[PDB]
Amino acid sequence: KRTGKPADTPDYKQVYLPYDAAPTERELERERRRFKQAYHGRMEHRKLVEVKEVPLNVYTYGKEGMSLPIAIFKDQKDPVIGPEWTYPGIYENKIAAQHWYTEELFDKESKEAFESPWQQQILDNQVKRRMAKVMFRMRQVNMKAVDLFQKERGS
Amino acid sequence: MAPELQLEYMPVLFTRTILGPQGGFAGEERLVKLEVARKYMEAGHAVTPTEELRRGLWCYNPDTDKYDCFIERNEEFLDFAARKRQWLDVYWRVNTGYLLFGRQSWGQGFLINCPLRKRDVAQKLWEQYKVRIDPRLIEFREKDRRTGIQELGHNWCWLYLPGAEELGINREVYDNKRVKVRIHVRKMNSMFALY
C-alpha cells in the first residue's frame, strides 16, 4: 500500500571514519564479491540467492560513523551508529536472530545444546504462534463452518 | 550351459538390501531366478558367491550411498542371517500368497452361515501355504471382530509377526509387525463345501 511509505529518500552521511587504515580497492572488491551471494532458508530446502544492492564499500557500510536518515524531529540530527559493544546483546543476537525452523530448534532442545541460552525463548514463541493458528480457526469454526481449501484459487 | 537347459535359478550374494519377495538383505547367499539374478547382478546389487566373497563383502549404507559398509560373514552373522531370512520368508510367503477359501451360503445378502474365526484362518495358512503360526497372533478387522468374518468375497485380516527389531527389519518390508493376510470366500453347494 501507498500509505505510510517514504515519498522521499535522503542519502547517507558518513560522520567519522571507523578505521584509520585505508583499504586498497582490491580489498574493497574482494569483500564485496564475498557479499553478492547469500543463503536462504535453514533446512533441507536451502538455496543460494544473489543479493541486490550490495554496497560499494563493505568496510564502511553499517558498523560505525554513519548517520542514518531516520531522523524525525526538526532538531533531530541523523543518528550516528556507535561501536558494536556499546549496543546491548548484539553478539548474542547474531547467534540467535535467524530463521529457526521448528523441527531444528526442537532437536537442539532434545540434545540439550543451544547456540544461545535464548533459543529456548525462540522455540517457546514459535510453538505459541503455531497453536494460535490452531486456536483462531477453532473460534472461527465455532461460529460457522469454514472448509479449508475447497474454493478455486486465483482466476 | 546349454541354451535349452537353463538353470532354474542361480545362487547369488546380495550387496543392497532389496524389498521384494525375490530380493534379500545385504550379505546373504540366496538362490533366485535367472531373470532376476541377471537384473540384480548387472546393476551391481548382487555378486557371484566366490569364496573370498563368502568370507567378507563390501555392501552399502543408504546414508553415504557408496559401497562402504564392510560385513564379514562369521558364525554370529550366519545365525543372524538364518533367523532374519526365516522371518521374512514367513513375511513374503503370506502376503504374496492369497488364501482361497470356500464354504456354504444361504439367505439373501452374501453372508456365510458359518462365520470365520481365528482358529480356521490359521488353518488355511497351514493347509495351503504350509505356514505354522500361533493363531493368537492373528487379529481381525474392527467390523469382523464382533460377528467373525462371515461375508462372501474379498476379505483381509492381519497377522502379527512378533520378533523383529533383533534382525534389523526396516524399510525392506511394508511394516515391521504386520502382514495383510488375504482371504477370499467363495460360496459353493453341498457337493463341494464343508460345514
Binding site: 477453532m138 469454526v141 465455532n142 461460529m143 463452518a145 469454514v146 472448509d147 | 500361533d134 493368537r136 497372533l137 492373528i138 487379529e139 481381525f140 474392527e142 471382530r145 464382533r146 502379527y160 512378533p162 509387525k177
Partner: protein
C-alpha cells in the same frame, strides 16, 4: 505374551459425530464420497 499387542476389543456401539457441538462437528469432518460399485 501375544495378547499384549494383539487387540481384541469388540466395539459394540459405533461412535457417532458430534452435532451438538459446532466446532467438533466441522473438526470431525470426514471428506469422503459415496461410490456404488460399477
Amino acid at each position: 505374551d501375544p495378547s499384549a499387542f494383539v487387540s481384541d476389543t469388540v466395539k459394540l456401539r459405533d461412535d457417532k459425530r458430534p452435532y451438538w457441538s459446532r466446532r467438533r462437528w466441522a473438526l470431525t469432518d470426514k471428506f469422503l464420497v459415496p461410490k456404488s460399485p460399477k
